[PDB]
Amino acid sequence: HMQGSLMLDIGGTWLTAEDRQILRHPEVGGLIIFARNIEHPAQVRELCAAIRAIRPDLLLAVDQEGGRVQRLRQGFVRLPAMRAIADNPNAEELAEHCGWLMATEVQAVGLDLSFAPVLDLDHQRSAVVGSRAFEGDPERAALLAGAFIRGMHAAGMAATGKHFPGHGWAEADSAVAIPEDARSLEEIRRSDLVPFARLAGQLDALMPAHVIYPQVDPQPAGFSRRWLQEILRGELKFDGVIFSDDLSMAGAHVVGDAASRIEAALAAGCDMGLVCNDRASAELALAALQRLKVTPPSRLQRMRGKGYANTDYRQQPRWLEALSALRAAQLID
Template sequence: MIGALMLDIAGTTLTPQDIEILQAPQVGGLILFARNIESPQQVRALTNHIRRIRPEILIAVDQEGGRVQRLKNGFTLLPAMGRFGELYQQHPEQALVLAEQCGWLMATEVLAVGIDFSFAPVLDVDDVSDVIGDRGFAKNVEDIPELAGAFMKGMHRAGMATTGKHFPGHGSVKADSHVAAAVDMRSYKEIYEKDMQSFIQLMPELDAVMPAHVIYPQVDSNPAGFSSYWIQEILRKQLKFNGVLFSDDLTMQAACVVGGADARIQAALQAGCDMGLVCNDREAASLALQGLEGFPFPDQTRLERMRGKIPDIDIGEQLALGSEWQTAKHAIEQFKQTIANK
């Protein structure tokens, strides 16, 4: 069974304490950070070990590109998604081809080292938010579905599920929800007509959605990730989304309005999330596990869709994943060089 908690580990190998907590039935996922990464070979050894402990676990990472990519040494350094949006203004067809190649390349490298999926793509508009910025594909909301759709097509072709974040939109909110309470005072109509459009148009291609730790007081008093209105009424009923719902990290400052880690994961699941993330705080993760005692397990059919097509290959000190990988890698690195030369 896949449990409802996703947590993290401290280092590049499993400690006895890691092994103990991974065996807790309600631990269903593990997210890797930069501190867990030394090389492709080491990551594959780590994920193989994790699966010997818990074969059913889902392993994730944030490998968006730009300033948010955890896999660096030995992996392709990807451009920020906003660079595709800039190219799209002048050369839309080229931008879409490169976005798809980038999605395929990211997914292929992540899968090769035994990680099921990256929490990608960001579907937020590049507006006033500093924490989003060029993590979003474009400043023009109408450009995002085309570009993100191409990126997701590449992910799917490689065998990776997609996760759109941060519903219903974080790009129009100045505050960084990692470190502060984030509030968006706009009406539902304004949010729907702008920020939500990329999610709505790409809904058929989304395997999962991550709600924002943002409060939209004109709609509901709770942050979207704790709001049964946003999750059950809007996402599930009105938009008919039947994929997985992951909470954003429940240790973020904007999530603390709900209480301790036990109360936060309970609130997220009761609102309709399938899995809650508790990162960079083992004490909080243990408290969240206690909070899950007696909770039903999440929908297994939904969560199984997030399992990546991980190849049965030996990874050496350097990635070598075939001719298509070489072609895509060259195209993305050439694109980055073109940007650098401007």
């Protein structure tokens, strides 16, 4: 039996009858919630509880978009960005507290995971070529995100890096065409690949970039056997979960419908296909998984959170200790 699974999403802040029926299918292994599914923490905890009453084994993920939920949604704990953390004598300690705080609250409301940390690099386009601004400091980026991952795991949450192998140098041409990064493999390996190489042993999952690297392979990372099998699993020895990219973002990347795209993603080596913002496409990908008679990836349940839904997390001593460490470093309040 081929292995594979589908992660999908819903329309609203509660489950419709159609949501409840699609979640029963065992090929569906996950659900991801976005800002439009989120009112406040109490509502999210209850939505997750409703989903687990149908499917206790489902993986429930939140995509926070660099922190949008904590911010357009009153009630979620509020945490410094990594730039603010990097500017401290105890930046690694402070990064751990943030990963711990973020993962503790996310699991408290019933989610398994947040898709974090970002491993992409900021490059200063117009800086002098070869200068530090031009290069983005990948070694420090991996240090801090490695400490952020430590806090995540200490709270019992699996860590997902993105977007492999790094979209920091990608260029878009016509806002519909697929972004490209035309450098050679050796150039990529020495820069945007570095945080992935440094942390591949610690990450539980990776999400591929929606970027073509033409000198390396004609296909986007997440549809590339070369990127996913040769380089990531082979050269980087990565043994965790590969998510696909959003299979319903398909601007000029013509493969066919979501059915033929999830087959392509699974064939390149992804474990779990993501189909967001398109119920009818999610149904098409589901049917494809059914025709292939897939069983879940043996790796999949590694993503399962070890914390648990609770309402008193904000009055636990460890919680107060982490916020008070962020306060003493002038990062909150």
